[PDB]
C-alpha cells in the first residue's frame, strides 16, 4: 500500500545489530514500511549510519612507559588501552570514528542490505 514510507515504522532485522566483529564485514537488513505497515516495495531512498562515541574522556601519558611496565599508555594514540575501549573517549574516538558502511538496495524488493566494519573495538551508538 506504498504511498509515504514512515521512518518510525521501519524495522531493522539481523544478527549483527548489537554484536560486532572488528575487521570483518557485519551485515544487517533495513526494511521499509508505510504508516500502517504493508512492506512498501517502491521505496527508493537512502540509509545512513552516522556513528557517535559514548563514554567519558580519559587519557594517560606515563613518561618512560618501560620502567613502570605501563602497557596502558605505551602507544601514544591509546591503542594499547585497557578493557574493550569501553567508556574511553580519546582523540581517536573523537575525530575519526569512521566505520565504512555500504548500502545495496535492490530494484524493487523491500530489503536494504547494509554492511559495515571498523578498525577498533568499543561501545558506540549507531544512528540508523
Amino acid at each position: 500500500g506504498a504511498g509515504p514510507v514512515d521512518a518510525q515504522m521501519c524495522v531493522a532485522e539481523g544478527a549483527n545489530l548489537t554484536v560486532g566483529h572488528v575487521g570483518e564485514w557485519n551485515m544487517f537488513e533495513v526494511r521499509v514500511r508505510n504508516r500502517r505497515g504493508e512492506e512498501v516495495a517502491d521505496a527508493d531512498g537512502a540509509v545512513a549510519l552516522c556513528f557517535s562515541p559514548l563514554g567519558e574522556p580519559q587519557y594517560s601519558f606515563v613518561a618512560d612507559p618501560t620502567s613502570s611496565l605501563s602497557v596502558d599508555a605505551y602507544r601514544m594514540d591509546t591503542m594499547l588501552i585497557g578493557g574493550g575501549r569501553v567508556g574511553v573517549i580519546t582523540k581517536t574516538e573523537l575525530t575519526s570514528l569512521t566505520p565504512e558502511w555500504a548500502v545495496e538496495k535492490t530494484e524493487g524488493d523491500c530489503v536494504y542490505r547494509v554492511k559495515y566494519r571498523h578498525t577498533r573495538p568499543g561501545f558506540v551508538l549507531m544512528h540508523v
Binding site: C50, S52, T98, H127
Partner: protein
Amino acid sequence: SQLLTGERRIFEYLLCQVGVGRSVVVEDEKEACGSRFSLLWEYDSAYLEK
C-alpha cells in the same frame, strides 16, 4: 545604443525551506561531498566558507 528587451525568461524556481543547523565551517565544495566528511549526528550542515 541598444534597446534592451534583455530576453525575459521562464525562471522556474523552488522556494525550499532548507533547515540547516549547527553547521561546521568547511572549505570549498570538493571536501564537503558526503563520502569524505561524514558529519556527526549533532552537526547537520556544512558552511562553504571560501
